[PDB]
Amino acid sequence: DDEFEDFPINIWEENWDDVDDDFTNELKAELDRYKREN
Amino acid sequence: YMINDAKTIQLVGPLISSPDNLGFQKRSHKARELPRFLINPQLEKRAFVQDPWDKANQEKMISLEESIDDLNELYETLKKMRNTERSIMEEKGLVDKAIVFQGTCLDMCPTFERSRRNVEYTVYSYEKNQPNDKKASRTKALKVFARPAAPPLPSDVRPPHILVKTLDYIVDNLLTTLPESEGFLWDRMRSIRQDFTYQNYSGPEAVDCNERIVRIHLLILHIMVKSNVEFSLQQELEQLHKSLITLSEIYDDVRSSGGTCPNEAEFRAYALLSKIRDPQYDENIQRLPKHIFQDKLVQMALCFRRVISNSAYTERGFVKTENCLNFYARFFQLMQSPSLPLLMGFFLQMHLTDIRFYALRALSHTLNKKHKPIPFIYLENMLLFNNRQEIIEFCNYYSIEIINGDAADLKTLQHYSHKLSETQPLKKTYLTCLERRLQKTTYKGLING
């Protein structure tokens, strides 16, 4: 249950914008294929 | 008195496991009065009950309506009769000076009310046998929404089955009188819902009546806008919203009692569209069972809430939220889907101007300063405008400069909100495809589902 129980008295990736991915690989596969056809 | 039994007491359980160890002995306690905070609308059909005097008194009123031809004499005759009626009904305990109030008016309009509206000449042409009749027809008159001080008598309120009969008459005979009858229908439908509240009744008749009235409201919204007949959009949406709140409350109470309502998903979907940007309805819909949440109508409404959401929506008192879609393109695609229920589309036509404004507002921010004016043909297809005159009027309302009568200079849009300060709102509009779909069906079929 979401209610707290009684108890009387960094977490975050600093940079995930800066790894292989199957979806990413297919994406640049489409990106390169679009480049040749145009 | 409180509920003492064997099954309920065993089910709830004891306060402690072994009271006799502590020195307690089982005592036969007297029955104690039910506390104030445990006092408990009716959810099941009840057989109609009418007091013999009330039945006899009402029959005299009908007889006098037939006999007395003078309008004022008949009204004064029923006035003194009503004064006698109230004290007698008070003495019988059937009306307050709690009582489970039961309506006993078997006409669509109380006989006393018919004579009163004859004197005040507030009888509609729809409520008369012939247009020039001096008397309101007993089989055609509809009770108005009560606007009083004394509690309504049983003879003033129609019972649930008569209320269903009244709505059936409206559906069968009065839908085609729109848009001329919108004031009449709006008031009469409000009275039908008022009678249910008077009896505190939430049975199947209340569900059926509220559901079809909501459907009639959605039909009215499109008919009045398409016909360009002046009406209060606010009053139509308020009652439509109130009937949806009532339906949600009955759906909740029925669920708590272990029953089901076959049409709940359809009207949960409508309620999701009454306040399209209110997070409250997103919260409430998530609490509902899976088969309601996953119903196609609810899913369709949830899609519309997502596409309409906008992080730039500007209105006093509205809190902007993060990462909203502003998917105006998807909105107009969904608007044209043949799987879109027609009445649902009528509800969503209320936001056409708002969605269009913020589409142009958002697109203009992506244009650099040198960009040429956007051709109307592009915007008309992107925003599904009905004709060239509509987009011209739209740009004029928002002071968007028009170049050569066929292009819009989007950088001239200076407003950041769809609502202008010292101006009346833009004239409400509709979608041509939805109007064409209406012409391929009947009003009665739409309301009856």
């Binding site: 979401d2 707290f4 129980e5 009684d6 108890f7 960094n10 977490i11 975050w12 990736e13 914008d17 991915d21 990413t24 994406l27 489409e30 990106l31 480049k35 145009n38 | 409180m2 309920t8 709830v12 359980g13 004891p14 306060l15 009271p19 502590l22 020195g23 307690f24 002995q25 005592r27 104690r32 039910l34 506390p35 445990l38 408990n40 708590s256 272990g258 997070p279 919260e283 819909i285 998530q286 899976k290 369709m300 949830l302 997502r306 959401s309 992080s311 809190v319 939220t321 993060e322 990462n323 909203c324 393109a329 998807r330 889907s337 697109l363 921010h365 992506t366 650099n368 040429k372 956007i374």
Partner: protein, 450 residues
């Protein structure tokens, strides 16, 4: 004569045996019940009214009499049959704290909190039998919230020029009362009733720094405040409370379970704002399947897979709905996902291959891979929230919202059917960091409440 002995204690502020928990005082209540049997209601009132040293307070005397009535007639074999006595006494007890100068109020404060915990648990059990007791849903707990709300309204701060630093008992339990009330409103499925409680909390507080309250009461308040914000789709507002509540917690197995409760909301809330957790420090609070589950969604969002995000939400639909997370995730996750998908496109197209103009047809091909099936496509002939929102045809709309949210620095040319970005190799100039952009556009209420 136990009844006379009990009244002597209560008249002098001794409330050792003043409780509804028979596990604590059942033996004395059993003796009290036997001795009180035979005296009618009038005589019990007379015992209290005529007792020496009894405070001349109507509400205090009403409270003592209701306890005597409770002791006389309590049926320990039936919680339901005794409930009216129990609930009546509890209301009388709380009414003894409404007046700030009521007799023995400071001694009554520990009793009221202790009895509140008892009555909340009992009201919850009784509510679960609403069908059998012919009561509306949450009727018992809503009655308790009504009583606790009136006590909350009676709490006022001392004057701005108070003669002493004393903290009265009502002020000491202010945040405790706030958390108890807001917990009830969430339980009875009316969490928006917290709005009055949240708004009037600080004005009633005599402490002028929120951190002066007990840390455990601070954490639960932020947890409930964050959930209230999230129910209003105010993601950044919720995140600040969720993040601050969890960090304070890091500074019992109940504490570990409480940390899990924050994480269930902090993780999706941070993800919407383009923030991802480090799974390492979160291991003591989360089971491995929970980490794996969010990591899959993390994968879809990070690399711009719209279909993966939709399918992940579809898989998790039921438990997300139970926490009111499905709708907010379904609505506000795509734009983060779209940004990452567009960022990868620009990285190859612009920063690598030098093309600052992006044709809409290129984006449509990219969007077709990311979105996949839509409501119109064959094979999905019924609309769902998972196939009815996103369509690869709406290239300009996707770009426009990304620009309007500040996530994409670009210009749109609808007549040319192309998108123009700045000529550069630095991708962060075209696609700025997500969390900074969102939080700048939607600043949150400060983590420092006051």
């Amino acid at each position: 004569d136990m009844a006379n002995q009990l009244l002597d204690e209560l008249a002098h502020g001794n409330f050792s045996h003043l409780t509804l928990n028979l596990s604590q005082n059942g033996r004395e209540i059993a003796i009290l019940q036997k001795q009180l049997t035979g005296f009618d209601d009038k005589q019990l009132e007379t015992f209290v009214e005529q007792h020496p040293a009894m405070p001349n307070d109507t509400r205090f005397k009403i409270m003592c009499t209701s306890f005597l009535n409770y002791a006389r007639d309590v049926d320990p074999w039936s919680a339901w049959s005794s409930s009216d006595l129990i609930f009546e006494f509890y209301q009388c007890l709380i009414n003894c704290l409404i007046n700030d100068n009521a007799p023995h109020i400071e001694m009554l404060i520990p009793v009221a909190t202790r009895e509140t915990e008892f009555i909340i648990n009992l009201a919850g059990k009784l509510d679960s039998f609403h069908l059998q007791l012919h009561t509306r849903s949450h009727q018992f707990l809503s009655h308790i919230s009504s009583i606790l709300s009136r006590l909350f309204n009676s709490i006022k701060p001392p004057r701005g020029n108070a003669s002493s630093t004393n903290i009265p008992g009502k002020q000491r339990i202010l945040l405790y009362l706030v958390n108890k009330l807001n917990n009830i409103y969430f339980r009875i499925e009316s969490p928006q009733l917290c709005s009055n409680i949240f708004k009037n909390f600080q004005p009633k507080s005599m402490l002028a720094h929120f951190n002066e309250y007990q840390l455990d009461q601070q954490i639960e308040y932020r947890y409930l405040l964050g959930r209230y914000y999230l129910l209003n789709s105010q993601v950044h507002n919720a995140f600040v409370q969720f993040n601050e509540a969890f960090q304070s917690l890091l500074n019992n197995q109940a504490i570990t379970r409480n940390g899990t409760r924050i994480l269930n909301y902090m993780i999706p809330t941070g993800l919407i704002l383009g923030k991802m957790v480090k799974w390492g420090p979160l291991r003591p609070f989360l089971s491995q399947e929970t980490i794996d589950n969010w990591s899959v969604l993390y994968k879809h969002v990070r690399y711009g897979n719209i279909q993966g995000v939709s399918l992940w939400l579809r898989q998790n639909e039921r438990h997300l709905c139970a926490r009111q997370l499905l709708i907010v995730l379904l609505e506000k996750l795509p734009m983060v996902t779209y940004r990452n998908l567009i960022k990868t496109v620009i990285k190859s197209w612009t920063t690598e291959w030098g093309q600052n103009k992006l044709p809409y047809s290129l984006i449509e091909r990219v969007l077709q891979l990311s979105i996949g099936p839509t409501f119109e496509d064959p094979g999905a002939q019924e609309i769902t929230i998972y196939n009815g929102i996103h369509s690869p045809k709406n290239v300009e709309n996707v770009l426009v919202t990304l620009i309007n949210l500040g996530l994409l620095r670009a210009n749109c040319f609808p007549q040319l059917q192309l998108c123009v970005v700045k000529k550069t190799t630095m991708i962060q100039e075209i696609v700025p960091p997500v969390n900074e952009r969102i939080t700048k556009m939607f600043p949150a209420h400060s983590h420092v409440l006051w």
